[PDB]
Design a protein around this ligand. Structure first.
Ligand SMILES: O=C(O)CCCC[C@@H]1SC[C@@H]2NC(=O)N[C@@H]21
Ligand SMILES: O=C(O)CCCC[C@@H]1SC[C@@H]2NC(=O)N[C@@H]21
Lengths: 115, 115
């Protein structure tokens, strides 16, 4: 099973990839995200990711701005690792610049499998 | 009104403080969090924070490990800035190491005011 390690790649049910680049001694995470969810904006280019790992708990977040496309928004995922196949089961929140109410924060669920 | 700037402090309804230390040119955030919610664990000591800012959108997350106390968990906040008083209205998710179901991810709402 792939575990939560530096240079690990994870794909969700919609085909999006999280790449974890580094996890430091304190568990701080860097990486990048490529969105491929059918019909979504900001697809097919890398967006920087930061976050934390604590054992099997993981959080990661991306700002949807790069040289290719801006979605004026930020997603945060909270989740946990489960295993002979590694997966990360998450809940996510997406907040958009210019929001007026927490009711406008989109929520969903993503399950990522090792690759 | 205090706005989303480096070296800004924000207090929620439960008395916890977010301190934003830096926001870089790309909007990546560093800071620290001190929890003071009545009855909570990991109170009264600083926990490192990372995250993103995009205009008025903000995400930030902390791993609850420091030299004083470990809570084996990570919180992520997603929210937005509103204003003559600055506030950040957020939804948060708390995930614990060793979780087996997304139903175990605690959710809540925090509203932070400038100080
Ligand atoms: O629409 C936006 O504001 C930017 C793209 C958001 C894509 C989201 S993030 C949560 C979910 N998981 C994915 O892999 N894609 C969508
Ligand atoms: O119990 C834990 O696992 C660690 C402390 C969690 C404190 C939470 S984070 C969400 C909410 N906002 C606060 O200021 N404190 C609680």
């Amino acid at each position: 099973a792939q575990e939560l390690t530096a240079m690990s790649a994870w794909v969700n049910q919609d085909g999006s990839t999280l790449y974890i680049n580094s996890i430091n001694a304190q568990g701080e995470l860097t990486g990048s995200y490529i969105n491929r969810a059918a019909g979504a904006a900001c697809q097919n280019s890398p967006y920087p990711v930061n976050g934390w790992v604590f054992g099997t708990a993981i959080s990661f977040s991306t700002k949807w701005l790069n040289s290719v496309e801006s979605c004026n928004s930020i997603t945060s995922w909270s989740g946990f690792y489960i295993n002979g196949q590694g997966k990360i089961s998450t809940l996510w929140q997406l907040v958009v610049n210019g929001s007026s109410s927490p009711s406008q924060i989109l929520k969903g669920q993503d399950v990522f499998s090792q690759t």
